[PDB]
Amino acid sequence: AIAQLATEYVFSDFLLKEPTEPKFKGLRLELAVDKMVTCIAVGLPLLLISLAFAQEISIGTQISCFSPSSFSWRQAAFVDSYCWAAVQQKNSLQSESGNLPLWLHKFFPYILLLFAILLYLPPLFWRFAAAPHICSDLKFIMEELDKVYNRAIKAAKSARDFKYPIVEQYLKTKKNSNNLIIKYISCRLLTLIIILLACIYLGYYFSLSSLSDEFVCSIKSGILRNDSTVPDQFQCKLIAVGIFQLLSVINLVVYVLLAPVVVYTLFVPFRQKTDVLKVYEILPTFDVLHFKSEGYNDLSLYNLFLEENISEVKSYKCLKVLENIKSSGQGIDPMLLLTNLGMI
Amino acid sequence: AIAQLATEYVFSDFLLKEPTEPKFKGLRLELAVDKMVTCIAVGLPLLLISLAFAQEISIGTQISCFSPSSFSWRQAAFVDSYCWAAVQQKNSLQSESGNLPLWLHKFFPYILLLFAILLYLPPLFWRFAAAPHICSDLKFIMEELDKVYNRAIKAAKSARDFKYPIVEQYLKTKKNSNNLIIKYISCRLLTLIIILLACIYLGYYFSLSSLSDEFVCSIKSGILRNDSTVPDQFQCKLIAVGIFQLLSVINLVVYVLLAPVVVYTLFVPFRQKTDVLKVYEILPTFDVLHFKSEGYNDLSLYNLFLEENISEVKSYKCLKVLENIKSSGQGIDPMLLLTNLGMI
Amino acid sequence: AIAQLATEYVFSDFLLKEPTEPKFKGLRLELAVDKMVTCIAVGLPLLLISLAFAQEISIGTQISCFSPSSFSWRQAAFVDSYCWAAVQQKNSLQSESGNLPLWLHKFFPYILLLFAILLYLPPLFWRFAAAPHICSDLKFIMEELDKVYNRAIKAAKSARDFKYPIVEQYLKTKKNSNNLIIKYISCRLLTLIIILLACIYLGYYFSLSSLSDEFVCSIKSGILRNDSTVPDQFQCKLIAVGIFQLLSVINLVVYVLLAPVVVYTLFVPFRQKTDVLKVYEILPTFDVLHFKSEGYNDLSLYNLFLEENISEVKSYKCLKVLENIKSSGQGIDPMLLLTNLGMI
Amino acid sequence: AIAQLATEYVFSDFLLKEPTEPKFKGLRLELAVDKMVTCIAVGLPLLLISLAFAQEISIGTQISCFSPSSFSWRQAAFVDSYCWAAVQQKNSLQSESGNLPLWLHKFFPYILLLFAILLYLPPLFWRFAAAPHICSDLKFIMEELDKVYNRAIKAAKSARDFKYPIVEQYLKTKKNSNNLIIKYISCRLLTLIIILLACIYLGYYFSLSSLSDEFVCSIKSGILRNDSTVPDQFQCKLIAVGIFQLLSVINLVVYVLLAPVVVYTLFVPFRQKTDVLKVYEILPTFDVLHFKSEGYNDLSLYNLFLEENISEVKSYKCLKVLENIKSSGQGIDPMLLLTNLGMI
């Protein structure tokens, strides 16, 4: 039913499932905006496919040819099925709009499924190629941040009663390499191109005259070519073509609204803001150097992933509340850190 | 529905399920490229089979023979079913394209299922014959790497405050044996041959005239042979043949795009690059000798499997970050290793 | 659907499920070749049964008798159902090929299910009679091997810083008894005989003229015997008989390919090779005596089961890597064993 | 589908499910032969019921009466349904074989279900009445055996470096009481009687002329009794009667093969062999007295249950391997027991 389709595709965790494995425990591995874009671009065409053939919206068979009254039920059924299979056969049918509109009307669900698969492909390539590496690197970075926070609080407590910036060096090294950012931009660009092509196709499909679904059909090949009792042609109409056009314009609207989001996603350096690591600069055990901005490198992408999935880090949360309290400046950062006692 | 089939076969973990057993905990046991190739080559023909008979794309019955108006519904049904069963019986039907096109049109789903099964067979043979051995060997290798890393860090800590290369000897011994690599190449080659045969068949099927689905049928055997009221022949058409041809060309395109991937897979030594063990050479407890390249031996395959599923090793990750930091050369490898404190 | 059947029967763990109980944790209890043979011989006929009546391959009802035009729909339905039930009644129908072909055409699914059940019976008898005993014995043997390995490594460590061969005596005693091997050979032989009988039946079924599905039917018993308006006979055809013959020849090919595998399985002593226990002979705590070969006794079967499910034993894996390293001979077996430190 | 029914009823754990409760952890509570007999006798008739009405074997409706051509579809449907309901009404129909064959043809599924339920009743009575008691007693016996084995090995170890036979006294007391064995024999005898009655019924059903399914039907009661346009009688045939007879003879064959098994089961004392407790007689802490044989008492049944579910006992397994080694006599039983070190 329509409501069942809605529950499956919008109100359920459709493509929102976290990786089912212990390797990525709590790691999104995909930005929220990218996940939203993929979920829409994939589950919208599927939802429209399901809707267009819902038991309520669908009168019945997808084509009716209006055989003569003399024709029996199965003769008329032969006519309808023959014309359905003959939309491909150009000789059989003669339609003013041509045969491409008939092909599109017959295979619209296939085309929507193709667009959905093509849009799901780049996210899958990301999740299967560049996701494990970033997952491991980000897990190491979070562990290093937790360890340095613990060491700093232990030092502060000892004072009240190595020291090498490994994480900073690793981030600096990531500043050079760009394979991950190149893959990310390539997959986003392919998604954008697929969306644009889908928009072109949907606009063309919705621009039809709405009468191209009606085509003339001739069961006059073979032994029936010279038969007399059979009329030379029939009036066939492809039902649900109006529904297809409505859903196609809906998908076109959604995709044109979505494309600016993908374009904004492509410009990762601009998105790289609100320095996540700036909060850690007040730790004595952490060097006061952010050095993450203004670069078409994997460093900006790692900064984005950190700003996305750093809320799970207790040390980061503690430092964030310390920073927020520092806005008033009533107290002192080391005193607040010592009082917090948030090692684990 | 179409969307349900898509969710099952592309958006779900179809053939992507990890081995459901404690023996292989986190071990892929199959390269990512090989898994992708198998998943496509298997779940594409199944998806096309499901699509070709979807409740929306399917007008109804798969053949209609256009019985005379005088014929009753069940007489016409007898005609249609008789011709459906008589596509095999050459005498009954007379078609310009022959009888092989009719056989193919009737049994296209069976042929796609056969290709899917034949393509799934070599992966299954691998997973049931050569997977347990490589799993055990690779688990031992990872355990040995973890143990040697722990011993090296313990030695470094003791200095700050046996020694036999068992793993290196085991890898060197693997350099000689080649049964695993021979099995891998044989299964990949069989997959490639099956893909090529499927491409040949799909090209032949799509090259049909598109009118071979229309065949002349004669229910004139037995007591009806000399009956007069029955016409000497009927005009039967195999519905969904156009859909079969469309999906067959789609599968042909996918398989021709996939075959280069399989050929590239066959050349494992070329794939053997980015030495995974090179990072471990900086450990005092590990001998400085990689000795893994340029060989049609199981050593290259083991190197590939390591480069695939070594990200799960904390010691390997730590050594990798140490290597990446060494690019700048600001610090020292032993000092960084001591500061890391990543025993477990 | 066809794809659903494929997923259930070939791509899923159909009859590949491990024993659902804590008694056999990780124990196959069935050789890989035997499991493959049983899985094929059982799930192939079931798959063919499901395929032959798939919603796509099936035109509709399994028999159509072509009642006269004057006959109403339910009169024709009576004719068809009567002939379907009268394939058994020899007097009612008169077919050139006889009545056995009609019986076979009607009950082919039943015959395939019968063959599947008969082929599944010997494996079930094995798993319910001789599996618990071998499971317990093999678990004891693995525990003894682990314990002796632990004792030997402890002795080596003590030197660096009872002694009775219970397992060897148990294996020697198993050398005498042969009930398990006799049961194994009997079940394999029964499976082979069932496969041969199935091949005979399928060859006979596929050798039919292909026109035996068309039989003459007479609803002329009872009050209708002397009725005039009803024709003396009808032309009935059993639909799906061609599909049955195709699937029967497929099953015949599979079974003839499989029978050599079963024959090879029957010769267990030849299969008994690559001595698993030879690796343990280098342990000081283990006597240097294999004494397992060239016998129609349960010892060979136990050797096969060990070679099958010994990879799960850490001590065996360690000894195997020690053996492989010994190929070069660079080091020493006791030194390598001491350095391994693989007690648990 | 047929394959689905097979998977449910033969290839699945149909009635093979262990008690879903912590009270019986690993205790069969039912002998293997009895479980096999019950599973067959119950799931065979159910499987045949499902098969006889499978979507493939079933042409359609279960009765067709061949109404005149003048009759409309729903008039013919009224005729068919009336005759279906009138098989009971003797006046309406006049059949040569009588009315009992028609009753049986109509209610064969009900009769098979009745036999299945009646055969499942005694096993259920056992499992709900006499199973908890034997479970508790056998769990106590196994615990006592484990404790005495532990005490004996501890004594042997102490020597190398109460004593009352509670279990033997309990078994001796069980030698007197016979309520459990009486219940077991009664349930087995009732199962045998039900099987014999089912065989009688199936033989009678299969001995029919095969034409009793065709009966004459008269819709001539009420206002239609003196109606003229309606014929005085119709020719009705009960479809699937041949399938019923085939499946009934199959069930008859299975049950006649099974009855000897039940008779052999009834003679429990003969089955009481291969003394399970004989292995424990070599323990110093266990008295050398078996005293379990030649009795129509619960002791023999307890011996059977022990021989069935004693493999799960580590002490029993250890003593069994000691016994098997004693066949050669090379070593000594106490020395082997001390060396085993199998307390837990």
Ligand SMILES: CC(C)CCC[C@@H](C)[C@H]1CC[C@H]2[C@@H]3CC=C4C[C@@H](O)CC[C@]4(C)[C@H]3CC[C@]12C
């Ligand atoms: C997904 C991508 C490939 C879709 C591409 C656009 C498709 C949907 C449409 C939009 C405009 C269309 C074209 C418009 C006009 C013509 C001229 C005609 O004489 C032949 C077909 C041809 C050349 C059409 C082919 C299909 C077309 C290119």
Ligand SMILES: CC(C)CCC[C@@H](C)[C@H]1CC[C@H]2[C@@H]3CC=C4C[C@@H](O)CC[C@]4(C)[C@H]3CC[C@]12C
């Ligand atoms: C992503 C955004 C830009 C998509 C907006 C939809 C645009 C591309 C659509 C809307 C209307 C469409 C046009 C409608 C009609 C025709 C006439 C036909 O003979 C050729 C294609 C052509 C000229 C279409 C080309 C594509 C089109 C201009």
Ligand SMILES: CC(C)CCC[C@@H](C)[C@H]1CC[C@H]2[C@@H]3CC=C4C[C@@H](O)CC[C@]4(C)[C@H]3CC[C@]12C
């Ligand atoms: C999967 C593999 C086996 C498929 C092999 C190719 C199949 C699909 C096709 C492609 C070309 C075909 C052949 C083309 C021409 C002829 C000549 C004709 O007089 C008999 C059939 C025969 C000999 C065909 C047999 C089937 C064929 C070989």
Ligand SMILES: CC(C)CCC[C@@H](C)[C@H]1CC[C@H]2[C@@H]3CC=C4C[C@@H](O)CC[C@]4(C)[C@H]3CC[C@]12C
């Ligand atoms: C894997 C790649 C190479 C597959 C590409 C598809 C090729 C092999 C296909 C496409 C068109 C096909 C041809 C189309 C028509 C015919 C004529 C027929 O009488 C014999 C087969 C023959 C000659 C086919 C042979 C196979 C063919 C050449």
Ligand SMILES: CC(C)CCC[C@@H](C)[C@H]1CC[C@H]2[C@@H]3CC=C4C[C@@H](O)CC[C@]4(C)[C@H]3CC[C@]12C
């Ligand atoms: C599974 C086993 C039992 C199958 C045995 C073979 C079956 C399928 C077939 C193969 C050959 C067949 C026989 C061939 C010829 C004849 C002669 C005829 O006048 C009576 C039937 C009889 C005697 C057939 C009986 C059934 C038969 C034996």
Ligand SMILES: CC(C)CCC[C@@H](C)[C@H]1CC[C@H]2[C@@H]3CC=C4C[C@@H](O)CC[C@]4(C)[C@H]3CC[C@]12C
């Ligand atoms: C396991 C292997 C050997 C099976 C190979 C199939 C063999 C046994 C098949 C293939 C063709 C079959 C024959 C085909 C036709 C007939 C004629 C009939 O009147 C009697 C049976 C007989 C003679 C069949 C006997 C069995 C047969 C020879």
Ligand SMILES: CC(C)CCC[C@@H](C)[C@H]1CC[C@H]2[C@@H]3CC=C4C[C@@H](O)CC[C@]4(C)[C@H]3CC[C@]12C
């Ligand atoms: C499950 C048990 C109760 C089944 C008992 C046997 C049933 C199936 C059958 C087998 C033989 C049958 C009897 C055979 C002959 C006659 C004589 C007739 O004039 C009245 C019915 C009567 C008396 C039948 C009654 C039903 C009967 C007893």
Ligand SMILES: CC(C)CCC[C@@H](C)[C@H]1CC[C@H]2[C@@H]3CC=C4C[C@@H](O)CC[C@]4(C)[C@H]3CC[C@]12C
């Ligand atoms: C468990 C074993 C013994 C069952 C074997 C089936 C036996 C009991 C079957 C097979 C054929 C049957 C007979 C077939 C025909 C008739 C004639 C009828 O007027 C009375 C019942 C009677 C006489 C049946 C009695 C039961 C019968 C003898």
Ligand SMILES: *[C@@H]1O[C@H](CO)[C@@H](O)[C@H](O)[C@H]1NC(C)=O
């Ligand atoms: C139909 O009849 C016409 C008459 O002109 C003839 O040309 C043509 O070949 C016939 N077609 C068939 C299929 O027999």
Ligand SMILES: *[C@@H]1O[C@H](CO)[C@@H](O)[C@H](O)[C@H]1NC(C)=O
């Ligand atoms: C049909 O009638 C023809 C007349 O020539 C005859 O040859 C043939 O045998 C008959 N067929 C049947 C099946 O009776």
Ligand SMILES: *[C@@H]1O[C@H](CO)[C@@H](O)[C@H](O)[C@H]1NC(C)=O
């Ligand atoms: C049908 O009529 C014939 C005429 O010869 C007669 O012999 C036969 O008994 C009748 N059959 C029935 C069932 O009344």
Ligand SMILES: *[C@@H]1O[C@H](CO)[C@@H](O)[C@H](O)[C@H]1NC(C)=O
């Ligand atoms: C039918 O008509 C007959 C004429 O003899 C009469 O006896 C009978 O009562 C009538 N039945 C009904 C139900 O009116």
